[PDB]
């Protein structure tokens, strides 16, 4: 169930949730193997840690769980049809898996939809 | 202690055996005579430095696993003090870290001594000195570990307390038949015999009453078992369940139990009691009934009747105070290997066309995109239209 891995750590992605944050500096990737000559990355559907760069001051300088929604990288789907979204956007979640934003804005991958059901109900325009 | 999850306390020499074995396994056990003097100094030094760290590892593991008796609840700490001489246990804990601090200083003294190593055999004597002298410190603390393991056996045997939630304390005559009602109430059932102090240990039994958890808290009948029952009843947000043998089938007089109830009336204060007249089917009671807060219930312990009604009254008083498809899949191919067939699960007319496959697309066009219900009549009109267009 793997996707394309091209989003390395220490990157700025859009906090597309309704939590009020705008930008987030990527921090960590969960469950990533020790791979040399290739940074530990994630795609739309992986739980990651990031520190909010822009947005609320309480959210800023505070790392929390997050999952990628919009995939700027060519996420080669299992259906074969590749998809190139606008940019790299995501939504912050709790360590248990509760999305911080009460609403969702932007696109979220269907491959990411089945993994996280808490963030699935927060979105209505799943595309 | 309730959530102890502490490691067992082994023999000190056995603890020293594995620790020395850790020095025999983790440290480099070979030291060449041709190596550098400082390198040889660190061979016995860093091993001893790890040995003291190993000595500090299990000791701090024992220290962290040792809980604070003052941090325990008033009913938990007093019963623990009544269990295995917690004052002497804390003194051993006081003798544990201080000796560990003494072990820390002796190792630091030897480390500074090892910093000025001169000869190989002198360091070899020094390497023997710091290990064995600290082993003598382990040998000095001989009986300290003996009391911890039994306490570790006691704390593991000691269950969790449910004072914060709604609970029910059952105290009175020893095995007066209300314990049988208590055994019929909760999932955990305590065994009783005709002997005295049979229900010496408290029973942690989970139960619910009227959509509210009712914890049956067992207390020994009134020593050591009753003193623990006194300490548990001292600090508890629960009600009393005084079972009085009306027919003296519990071996105790009603006047002796009521006077004891009058004696235990200070501990029974600030709580709605239950004057369970046990052994109904088997004067001084009016003086006990003068309190008013005791729920006088006639309990036929011989006939085993009246427990649920008392459970309904006391809990309210406590509330007043407060084949299948999977079966088909089990026979077809098991879980994760059997496939479900949806051809039979169809409302189509022709069953032969139901199990048959359906052409999704043809000639570069989606066959379903141009498929309508009246397409057969439309195609017949299409064949006539093309014939008319040709004519």
């Amino acid at each position: 169930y793997r996707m394309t891995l091209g989003l390395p750590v220490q990157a700025i992605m859009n906090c597309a949730d309704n939590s009020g944050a705008k930008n987030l500096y990527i921090v960590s990737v969960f469950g990533t193997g020790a791979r040399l000559n290739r940074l530990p990355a994630a795609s739309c559907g992986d739980m990651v840690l990031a520190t909010v760069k822009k947005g609320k001051p309480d959210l800023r300088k505070k790392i929390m769980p997050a999952i990628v929604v919009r995939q700027r990288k060519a996420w080669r789907r299992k259906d074969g049809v590749y998809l190139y979204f606008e940019d790299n956007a995501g939504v912050i979640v709790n360590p248990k898996g509760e999305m911080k934003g009460s609403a969702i804005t932007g696109p979220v991958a269907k491959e990411c939809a089945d993994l996280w059901p808490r963030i699935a109900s927060n979105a209505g325009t799943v595309v | 202690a309730v959530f102890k999850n502490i490691t067992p306390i082994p023999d000190v020499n056995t603890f020293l055996d594995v620790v020395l074995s850790r020095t025999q396994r983790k440290t480099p056990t070979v030291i060449r005579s041709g190596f550098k003097i400082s390198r040889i100094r660190g061979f016995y030094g860093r091993k001893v430095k790890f040995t003291q760290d190993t000595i500090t590892e299990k000791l701090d593991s024992i220290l962290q696993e040792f809980p604070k008796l003052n941090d325990i609840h008033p009913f938990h700490a007093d019963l623990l003090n009544i269990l295995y001489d917690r004052d002497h246990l804390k003194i051993a804990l006081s003798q544990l870290s201080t000796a560990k601090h003494l072990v820390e200083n002796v190792a630091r003294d030897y480390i500074r001594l090892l910093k000025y190593g001169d000869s190989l055999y002198r360091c070899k004597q020094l390497k023997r000195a710091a290990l064995g002298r600290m082993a003598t410190i382990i040998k000095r603390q001989k009986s300290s570990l003996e009391f911890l393991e039994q306490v570790r056996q006691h704390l593991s045997r000691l269950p969790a307390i449910d004072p914060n939630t709604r609970t029910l304390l059952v105290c009175g005559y020893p095995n007066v038949g209300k314990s049988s009602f208590m055994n019929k109430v909760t999932r955990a059932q305590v065994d009783v015999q005709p002997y005295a102090f049979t229900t010496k240990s408290l029973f942690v039994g989970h139960f619910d009453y009227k959509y509210l958890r009712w914890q049956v808290i067992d207390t020994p009948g009134i020593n050591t078992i009753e003193m623990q029952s006194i300490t548990a009843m001292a600090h508890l947000r629960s009600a009393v369940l005084y079972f009085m043998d009306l027919s003296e089938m519990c071996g105790y007089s009603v006047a002796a139990q009521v006077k004891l109830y009058h004696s235990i009336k200070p501990l029974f204060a600030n709580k709605v009691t239950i004057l369970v007249l046990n052994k109904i089917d088997a004067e001084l009671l009016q003086t006990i009934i003068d309190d008013g807060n005791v729920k006088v219930v006639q309990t036929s312990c011989v006939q085993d009747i009246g427990v649920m009604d008392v459970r309904t009254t006391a809990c309210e008083a406590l509330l007043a105070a407060r084949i299948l498809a999977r079966d088909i899949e089990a026979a077809n191919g098991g879980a994760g290997v059997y496939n479900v067939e949806l051809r039979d699960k169809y409302i189509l007319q022709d069953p032969s066309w139901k199990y048959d496959r359906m052409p999704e697309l043809l000639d570069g066009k989606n066959v379903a995109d141009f498929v309508d219900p009246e397409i057969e009549a439309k195609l017949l009109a299409l064949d006539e239209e093309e014939e008319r267009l040709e004519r």
Partner: protein, 332 residues
Amino acid sequence: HGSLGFLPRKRASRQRGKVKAFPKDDASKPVHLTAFLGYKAGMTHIVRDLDRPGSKMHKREILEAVTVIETPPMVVVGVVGYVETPRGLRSLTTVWAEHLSEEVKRRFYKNWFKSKKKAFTKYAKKYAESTQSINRELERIKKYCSVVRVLAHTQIRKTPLAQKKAHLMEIQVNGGSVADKVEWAREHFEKTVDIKSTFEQNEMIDVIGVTRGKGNAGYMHRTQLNSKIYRIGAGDDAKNASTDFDATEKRITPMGGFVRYGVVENDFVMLNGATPGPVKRVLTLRKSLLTHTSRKALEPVSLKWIDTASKFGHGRFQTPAEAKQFLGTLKK
């Protein structure tokens, strides 16, 4: 350089994939074959439903990357017989059939068109004079044999190639008695034993070959294992490529011919993944060694739709038929 099982890295000897091991069989089984010979047409892709319970796409539609292999009907021309010795496995008698084509007679020769073409002349004479001499050697086969293998060479005329020498291979017959195998061999001499009687479209193949020379990496023989057959097509039938879900008749040969191969007219096997060697290198099929119980083989296979676009370039059409109605009328 960590897979020392494949070190040392030196090039292979035989351009044709040499079979080393042969599957364990019984005398209770009926007589059947193990090996075969095919050619590397090229890689393609398909779509197919997935009747695999317990997977994340159970009863879904998933692309699969595949490989069509050009497989002609296969000409058996005789047998060899092995006796078992403390020194290994020696071959006792080699008995051929009476007649050979020029293609397999090109195999024995280096310059067939220059030379006198006189191979197998006098052996055909003793075939006509005395078949009881052949009986004598066959009498020595059913008396003293343990492993029977039959000869074989490819119908390379049907394959559109400039190579005219046939490729000769053994196939070990498996099943039945030793006398049954010689009975099966002498009743199939000089004919062709076709591919559709070997496999059942649900069996897996461990295809072998020599990998692609890289202009000393490459040209090193491999035995790739565990590739699944999806369709043993019939070259005479024009419905080979067209599945039941895309009834409209179409051919497996893509437009503009295959890249580096060209056109395909004969039976093919539709094996997934890949195999060693470049396009139109000789290729070998064989049976599995252990009866493998993965559900990837125990499942049925029923295709959905095949892509036959122009691999030369980047085509966007299935057949030149449907292209013209999708396009307008050209200036032609």
